[PDB]
Amino acid sequence: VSHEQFRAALQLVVDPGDPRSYLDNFIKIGEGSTGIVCIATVRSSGKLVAVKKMDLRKQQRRELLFNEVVIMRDYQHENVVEMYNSYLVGDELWVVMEFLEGGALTDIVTHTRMNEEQIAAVCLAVLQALSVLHAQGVIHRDIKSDSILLTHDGRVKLSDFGFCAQVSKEVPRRKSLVGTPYWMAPELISRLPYGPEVDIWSLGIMVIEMVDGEPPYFNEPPLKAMKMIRDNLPPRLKNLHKVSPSLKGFLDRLLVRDPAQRATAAELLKHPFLAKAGPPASIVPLMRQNRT
């Protein structure tokens, strides 16, 4: 009943039609935030596209599904996954989008060790994206290695906007408890009104992922890790000797508890650590199809 009501609303917003008419050989590759991701073959071209499938009945907050359409209609960018078309297919929202065939940053972080040319390239790419989103008041709210995707030639793109929200003069802060526990900003876990600064902290946790292979407290149940994040000093790297003073100085601007003192994305683009970033080619050897 409110499901039927919701299918009808989504219908007025999405493209008409059914992309099964032009797509073949759907193969599941992933499950993430809000549903599954398949690759599919575009019949007329032989090209490959990704299809995000999101069951309306399985969302904590169905209304966040509109985020997939807002972000597509409005915030395209070099470092953001491009979204082609959305559809309602029975009880699911489908988004046909760019296939990032290099896979997710998670698979690199859990299986090899990045150097700082590589970390700087990822950080620079992510920060360019955030600088542009944050200037327009868009907060991603689920920054983590699982949300950073790569092309085969090593270009880095932000993905998975399903949890994002907007701030503006009339709604200067968000309040919702949203993200993935281990990456959540402290002010967000403490239920304070928050803004784009939350993505900056989450990026810091992603830097810890890149250096250590895991975010802090990863061995704790989620609820206990949030409590630890709320109450404790900023989390530390397992091994500080494994980062340069430059990388350490960079991280220290990210993992600041007071969001007013945390660096913005605009400021971070100017940080000397980013001078280390290699081109996309430098990221390539890290991917599963290339490492030994």
Binding site: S33, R61, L177, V178, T180, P222
Partner: peptide
């Protein structure tokens, strides 16, 4: 992987 909390 840990799931998002909404």
């Amino acid at each position: 992987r840990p799931k998002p909390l909404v």
